[PDB]
Coordinates of C-alpha atoms in Angstrom, one line a residue:
Chain E
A1 CA 44.4 6.1 25.6
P2 CA 47.6 8.0 24.5
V3 CA 48.3 11.6 25.9
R4 CA 46.4 14.4 24.1
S5 CA 47.9 17.9 23.3
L6 CA 46.8 21.0 21.8
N7 CA 48.9 23.7 20.1
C8 CA 48.2 27.4 21.5
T9 CA 50.0 30.9 22.5
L10 CA 50.0 32.7 25.6
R11 CA 49.3 36.3 26.2
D12 CA 49.6 38.0 29.7
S13 CA 46.9 40.2 31.1
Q14 CA 48.6 43.5 29.8
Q15 CA 48.9 41.9 26.5
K16 CA 52.6 40.6 26.4
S17 CA 53.5 38.1 24.0
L18 CA 55.9 35.3 24.8
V19 CA 59.2 35.0 22.8
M20 CA 62.4 33.0 22.9
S21 CA 65.0 35.2 24.9
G22 CA 68.1 32.8 24.3
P23 CA 68.4 28.7 24.0
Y24 CA 66.8 28.0 27.2
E25 CA 64.8 31.3 28.1
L26 CA 61.6 32.9 27.3
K27 CA 60.8 36.7 27.6
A28 CA 57.5 38.8 27.4
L29 CA 57.1 42.0 25.1
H30 CA 54.4 44.0 23.0
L31 CA 54.5 42.6 19.5
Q32 CA 53.0 44.7 16.7
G33 CA 50.3 42.7 14.7
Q34 CA 52.9 42.1 11.9
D35 CA 55.4 40.5 14.4
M36 CA 53.2 38.2 16.1
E37 CA 54.7 35.1 14.3
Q38 CA 57.8 35.7 16.5
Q39 CA 55.7 34.6 19.4
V40 CA 56.4 30.9 20.9
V41 CA 53.6 28.1 20.1
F42 CA 53.2 25.8 23.0
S43 CA 52.2 22.1 22.9
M44 CA 50.1 21.8 25.8
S45 CA 49.4 18.1 27.1
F46 CA 46.7 17.1 29.5
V47 CA 48.9 15.2 32.1
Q48 CA 48.2 13.2 35.3
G49 CA 47.8 15.1 38.4
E50 CA 45.2 16.0 41.1
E51 CA 41.8 15.6 40.4
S52 CA 40.3 19.0 40.6
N53 CA 36.9 21.1 39.0
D54 CA 39.5 24.2 39.3
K55 CA 43.1 22.9 38.6
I56 CA 43.7 21.0 35.5
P57 CA 47.3 19.3 35.3
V58 CA 49.2 20.5 32.1
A59 CA 52.7 20.2 30.5
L60 CA 53.9 23.1 28.3
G61 CA 56.4 22.3 25.6
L62 CA 58.2 23.9 22.4
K63 CA 58.2 21.0 20.0
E64 CA 60.2 22.6 17.6
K65 CA 63.1 23.0 20.1
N66 CA 62.4 19.6 22.0
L67 CA 61.9 21.6 25.1
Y68 CA 59.5 21.5 28.2
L69 CA 59.0 24.1 30.8
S70 CA 60.1 22.8 34.2
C71 CA 60.3 23.9 37.8
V72 CA 63.4 23.1 39.8
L73 CA 64.9 24.2 43.1
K74 CA 68.3 26.2 41.8
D75 CA 70.4 26.6 44.9
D76 CA 67.7 28.2 47.3
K77 CA 65.3 29.4 44.6
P78 CA 62.4 27.7 42.9
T79 CA 63.0 28.5 39.1
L80 CA 61.4 28.4 36.1
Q81 CA 63.7 26.8 33.4
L82 CA 63.6 24.9 29.5
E83 CA 64.7 21.3 29.7
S84 CA 65.7 19.2 26.6
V85 CA 63.6 16.0 26.3
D86 CA 63.7 13.0 23.9
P87 CA 60.7 13.5 21.6
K88 CA 60.2 9.7 21.1
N89 CA 59.4 9.7 24.9
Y90 CA 57.5 13.1 25.4
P91 CA 55.0 14.1 25.8
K92 CA 53.5 11.2 28.1
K93 CA 50.6 11.3 30.4
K94 CA 52.7 10.5 33.5
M95 CA 55.0 13.8 33.3
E96 CA 57.4 13.7 36.0
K97 CA 56.5 16.5 39.0
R98 CA 58.8 19.2 37.6
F99 CA 57.0 19.6 34.2
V100 CA 53.6 19.7 35.9
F101 CA 51.5 23.0 36.0
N102 CA 47.8 23.2 37.4
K103 CA 46.2 25.3 35.0
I104 CA 43.4 27.2 36.8
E105 CA 41.0 29.7 35.1
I106 CA 39.8 32.8 37.2
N107 CA 37.7 35.4 35.6
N108 CA 38.0 34.3 32.2
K109 CA 42.2 34.4 32.7
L110 CA 44.7 31.6 33.1
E111 CA 47.0 30.9 35.9
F112 CA 49.7 28.3 35.8
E113 CA 50.8 27.0 39.3
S114 CA 53.6 24.9 39.5
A115 CA 52.7 21.3 40.8
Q116 CA 56.4 20.8 42.4
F117 CA 56.2 24.3 43.9
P118 CA 52.4 25.0 45.2
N119 CA 51.7 28.9 45.2
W120 CA 54.5 29.3 42.5
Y121 CA 53.1 30.7 39.1
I122 CA 54.5 31.2 35.7
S123 CA 54.9 35.1 35.8
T124 CA 56.2 38.0 33.8
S125 CA 57.3 41.5 34.9
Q126 CA 55.4 44.5 34.4
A127 CA 58.4 46.1 32.5
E128 CA 59.2 45.2 28.8
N129 CA 61.5 42.6 27.4
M130 CA 62.3 40.9 30.8
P131 CA 62.4 37.2 31.2
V132 CA 59.2 34.7 32.0
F133 CA 59.9 33.6 35.3
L134 CA 58.5 31.4 38.7
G135 CA 57.0 33.6 41.0
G136 CA 55.8 33.2 44.4
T137 CA 52.8 34.6 44.7
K138 CA 49.5 35.0 42.3
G139 CA 49.3 38.6 43.6
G140 CA 51.7 41.5 44.1
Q141 CA 53.2 43.6 41.1
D142 CA 54.1 40.9 39.0
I143 CA 51.8 39.4 36.4
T144 CA 50.2 35.9 36.5
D145 CA 47.2 35.9 34.6
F146 CA 46.9 35.2 31.1
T147 CA 44.6 34.4 27.8
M148 CA 45.2 31.4 25.6
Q149 CA 44.7 31.5 21.8
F150 CA 44.4 28.0 20.4
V151 CA 46.3 27.5 17.0
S152 CA 44.4 25.7 14.2
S153 CA 45.4 22.2 13.9
Chain D
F1 CA 49.7 12.2 15.1
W2 CA 46.9 14.8 14.5
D3 CA 43.6 13.2 15.0
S4 CA 40.3 14.4 13.0
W5 CA 39.6 17.1 15.7
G6 CA 43.0 18.6 15.8
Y7 CA 44.5 17.0 19.0
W8 CA 48.0 15.8 18.5
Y9 CA 47.8 12.4 20.5
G10 CA 51.3 10.5 21.7
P11 CA 55.0 11.8 21.9
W12 CA 56.2 14.2 19.5
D13 CA 58.1 11.6 17.5
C14 CA 55.5 8.6 17.1

């Protein structure tokens, strides 16, 4: 069977939506109901990873920009980055480790743990208009819990 | 391509 994907949007537990901050960055802010179309639409693929009832291995891409979210060690820091890919080759079932996130549902909210960096999560700051980043905890002050809205397809 | 249930199968450029 070939790789399957669904279109969706993310909203953190504090109701912040995700938008393009630049060509290779995402930021999080509260959008008015009329500005919702500025939010990024992700192509979420169900990829190869650890067989778990809790963790669902996924890859998150931005189809129109040929980008995938990826986790890389930048100098001494595990870092969330947007990486360009060849759309003729991606998505695929066997996504390289840097592209894999373990999607975990907890109290009806979603967390996205980096497979490359266990215990590191897709995170937002409590402050407005700050970049989306990789955070070293699902706890503390930063936000790691989201809701997903699927887009008609 | 989009199947009858709304899943996109294969790469972005099939």
